[PDB]
Each structure stands twice: as structure tokens, then as C-alpha cells.
Amino acid sequence: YNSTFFSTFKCYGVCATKLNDLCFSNVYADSFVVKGDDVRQIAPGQTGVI
Amino acid sequence: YNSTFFSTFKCYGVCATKLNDLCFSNVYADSFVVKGDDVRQIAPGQTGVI
Ligand SMILES: CCCCC/C=C\C/C=C\CCCCCCCC(=O)O
Ligand SMILES: *[C@@H]1O[C@H](CO)[C@@H](O)[C@H](O)[C@H]1NC(C)=O
Ligand SMILES: *[C@@H]1O[C@H](CO)[C@@H](O)[C@H](O)[C@H]1NC(C)=O
Ligand SMILES: *[C@@H]1O[C@H](CO)[C@@H](O)[C@H](O)[C@H]1NC(C)=O
Ligand SMILES: *[C@@H]1O[C@H](CO)[C@@H](O)[C@H](O)[C@H]1NC(C)=O
């Protein structure tokens, strides 16, 4: 909350407000770089080049 | 996918991922120009000047 800010943050399967009350089993992080118009394509049930 | 890119693309009545498996009956295309803040108004159940 002091340094880093996100333009988009969207969660699926769980309300965000409960993220501090849970514990997570098999955590993986995927990283890549896209353009601004392709960020909407990173979602379930989407079409496009990405 | 080589030349043209869209800032918004939203479909109603069908998942986008099935658009290649179907065939369409009465296809019409409407064209116009708006400002950036009015693009959110082109949707069902919306209010505003547009
Ligand atoms: C110009 C005539 C088009 C007629 C097609 C009629 C029905 C087909 C339905 C949808 C086609 C979507 C075309 C654009 C897809 C953009 C994909 C993307 O990059 O996000
Ligand atoms: C937040 O960042 C500022 C500037 O770098 C720093 O002075 C401050 O100590 C930070 N706060 C915490 C709690 O680390
Ligand atoms: C990221 O790392 C670089 C170098 O390690 C540092 O200069 C920068 O301040 C860091 N940014 C944040 C938000 O911590
Ligand atoms: C994509 O565009 C580039 C640049 O115009 C062109 O050289 C290339 O042949 C195009 N690809 C296809 C499959 O048409
Ligand atoms: C659109 O048409 C113009 C002229 O016909 C052409 O110069 C331009 O490259 C075309 N754009 C695309 C994305 O095909």
C-alpha cells in the first residue's frame, strides 16, 4: 500500500475481502507483458489473438 | 490479428469462444462516431445523452 499500485485487479472464485482469512494450497504465478488493449483478453471465456 | 485492434469488444447472447462454430441469420452492422466517455453508453439498459 506504500509503493505499488495496480490498474486492474480482478479475482475469480472468491470475494477479495476474504483474502486475509483463508489459506491457499497450490499457488502459481504467471508473468508476461502485453499492450494496453490486450489486458481485457486475460479473462475466462475471451477471444482475440492473445 | 495482423493490423486492426479494438479497445472494447463485448458480446451479448453468446460466448465469444464459440463464434467460429456457428452460423448467423440476419446480420446488420451499425456505424457511428462518439467521444471516449460515451462508449460505456452503448450497452443494454443504459442512460445518458447518447
Ligand atoms: C464486417 C462483417 C462482420 C460480420 C460478422 C458477423 C458475425 C460474426 C460475429 C462476430 C465477429 C467478430 C469480428 C471481430 C472479432 C474481433 C476479435 C478481437 O480481436 O477481439
Ligand atoms: C513508506 O514509504 C516512505 C517513502 O519511501 C518511507 O519513508 C516510509 O517509511 C514507508 N513506510 C513504511 C511503513 O515502510
Ligand atoms: C524496485 O527495485 C528497484 C531496484 O531494486 C528499486 O530502485 C525500486 O525502488 C523498486 N520499486 C519498488 C516499488 O519497490
Ligand atoms: C502481416 O503484416 C505484415 C506487414 O504489413 C506483412 O508483411 C505480412 O505479410 C502480414 N501477414 C499476413 C499473413 O498477411
Ligand atoms: C486502411 O485503408 C488505407 C487506404 O485504403 C490504408 O492505407 C491502410 O493501411 C488501411 N488500414 C488497414 C489496417 O488495413
What secondary structure does DSSP assign to A3-43, as a single string?
S---S----SSS-GGGTTS---SS---------GGGGGGSS
Residue having the nearest C-alpha atom to atom 14 of ligand 5: B3
The answer to whether the CB of B17 falls within 8 A of the CB of A44 is no
Asked if the C-beta of A45 comes within 8 angstroms of chain B's C-beta atoms, the answer is: yes
Amino acid identity of residue B16, one-letter, is: A
The answer to whether the CB of B38 falls within 8 A of the CB of B48 is yes
Sign of CA dihedral B29, B47, A40, A16: negative
Amino acid identity of residue B12, one-letter, is: Y
Structure solved via = cryo-EM
Residue having the nearest C-alpha atom to atom 8 of ligand 5: B3
Resolution in A for the shown PDB structure? 2.6
How many residues are there in chain A? Answer: 50
Q: Which three cell numbers stand for residue B8?
A: 472494447
Amino acid identity of residue B21, one-letter, is: D
Asked if the C-beta of A48 comes within 8 angstroms of chain B's C-beta atoms, the answer is: yes
Q: Find the B2 Cα to ligand 4 centroid distance in Å.
A: 7
Distance between CA A9 and CA A44 in Å, rounded?
A: 14
